[PDB]
A paper describes a structure:
Dystroglycan (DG), a ubiquitous membrane receptor belonging to the glycoprotein complex associated to dystrophin, plays a crucial role in the stability of the plasma membrane, especially in skeletal muscle tissues where it is highly expressed. A single gene, DAG1, encodes for a protein precursor, which is proteolytically cleaved in two subunits, alpha-dystroglycan (α-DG), located at the extracellular side of the plasma membrane where it binds several extracellular matrix proteins, and beta-dystroglycan (β-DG), which is a transmembrane protein that interacts with dystrophin in the cytoplasm. The molecular structure of the N-terminal region of α-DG (α-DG-Nt) was later determined at high resolution by X-ray crystallography, revealing the presence of two domains, an immunoglobulin-like (Ig-like) domain and a domain similar to the small subunit ribosomal protein S6 of T. termophilus (S6 domain), connected by a flexible loop. Noteworthy, it has been shown that α-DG-Nt is necessary for recruiting LARGE and some pathological conditions that are caused by missense mutations in the DAG1 map within the α-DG-Nt.
The crystal structures of D109N and V72I have been determined to a resolution of 1.70 Å and 1.80 Å, respectively. The Asp109→Asn mutation introduces local changes on the molecular geometry that are quite evident in the final refined model. The Asn109 side chain rotates nearly 120° around Cα-Cβ with respect to the orientation held by Asp109 in the WT. The conformation assumed by Asn109 allows for the establishment of H-bonds with Lys203, Glu116 and His107. Accordingly, Asn109 is not engaged anymore in H-bonds with Ser112 and His111 as Asp109 is in WT. In addition, the H-bond network involving Asn109, Glu116 and Lys203 in D109N abolishes the interaction between Lys203 and Glu116 observed in the WT structure. In this respect, it must be emphasized that the Asp109→Asn mutation not only changes the H-bond network involving residue 109, but also modifies the local electrostatic potential, so that the interaction of Asn109 with the surrounding positively charged residues like Lys203 and Arg77 is affected. This is confirmed by the presence of two water molecules (HOH 548 and 621) absent in WT structure and coordinating Arg77, thus filling the void left by the Asn109 side-chain relocation. In details, the mutations Asp109→Asn and Thr190→Met led to a significant increase in the maximum dimensions (with Dmax increased from 90 ± 3Å for WT to 95 ± 3Å and to 100 ± 3Å for D109N and T190M respectively) and in the Rg values (from 25.20 ± 0.04Å for the WT to 26.40 ± 0.04Å and to 27.20 ± 0.04Å for D109N and T190M, respectively), suggesting a more extended shape of the two pathological mutants compared to the WT protein.
Author numbering: 58 to 163, 179 to 303
The structure:
């Protein structure tokens, strides 16, 4: 009698940046009902998302191939005496994945380069689940002193494991690079130079000694600091 309708607001995401939203399951599910979260019209989520049923958190880390709008269905079903799932309600919202974070947490002055620290990892993000992508970011926090949601994680492109414009850099623990590679990066400041970069020993030393890779779960190829043209 008199069903309730819950609207969930649409969200936004950016390639290479962590995504996290709470879903109001206590409003959608009358006691006893089973919640399902999927891509609308499918049983699975999009490949970049992960649903935590006990925390009610939908989270993910999109790749360039996830650009665009994703409709997500949150549905509640009654479990019948015979084991059937009787759907009761469905609430659908969308998430638009945008292509570029412009190296900004979300800023430097216009046309002022952003100083970015990048760690190059022997990893293939397309082989990793969303949870694995997020946990790699989580594991980097000890070293970056940047929160999960302000780091960036994207694949290597054109097989380039270096940045020749970098004015500081150093080695990791890896001797071979087996996978395509991943770039895990964050902002240090605006238009910095060697003399104004913060203390980076807490990156460079564990990178070279192998303590960083032991904590991240992936081999570290190297790191570098470079000023990136603004976008």
């Amino acid at each position: 009698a008199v069903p309730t309708v819950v609207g969930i607001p649409d969200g936004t995401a950016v390639v290479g940046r962590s995504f996290r939203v709470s879903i109001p399951t206590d409003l959608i599910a009358s006691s006893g009902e089973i919640i399902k979260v999927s891509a609308a019209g499918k049983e699975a989520l999009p490949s970049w998302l992960h649903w935590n049923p006990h925390s009610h958190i939908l989270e993910g880390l999109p790749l360039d191939t996830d650009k665009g709008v994703h409709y997500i269905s949150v549905s509640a079903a009654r479990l019948g005496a015979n084991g059937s799932h009787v759907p009761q309600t469905s609430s659908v919202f969308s998430i638009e994945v945008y292509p570029e974070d412009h190296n900004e947490p979300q800023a430097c002055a216009a046309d002022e380069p952003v100083t970015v620290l990048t760690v190059i990892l022997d990893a293939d993000l397309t082989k990793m689940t969303p949870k694995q992508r997020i946990d790699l970011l989580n594991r980097m926090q000890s070293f970056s002193e940047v929160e999960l949601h302000n780091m960036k994680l994207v694949p290597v492109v054109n097989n380039r494991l270096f940045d020749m414009s970098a004015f500081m850099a150093g080695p990791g623990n890896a001797k071979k690079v087996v996978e395509n590679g991943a770039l895990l990066s964050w902002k240090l400041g605006c238009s910095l130079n060697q003399n104004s970069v913060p203390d980076i020993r807490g990156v460079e030393t564990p990178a070279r000694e192998g303590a960083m890779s032991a904590q991240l779960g992936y081999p570290v190829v190297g790191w570098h600091i470079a000023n990136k043209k603004p976008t």
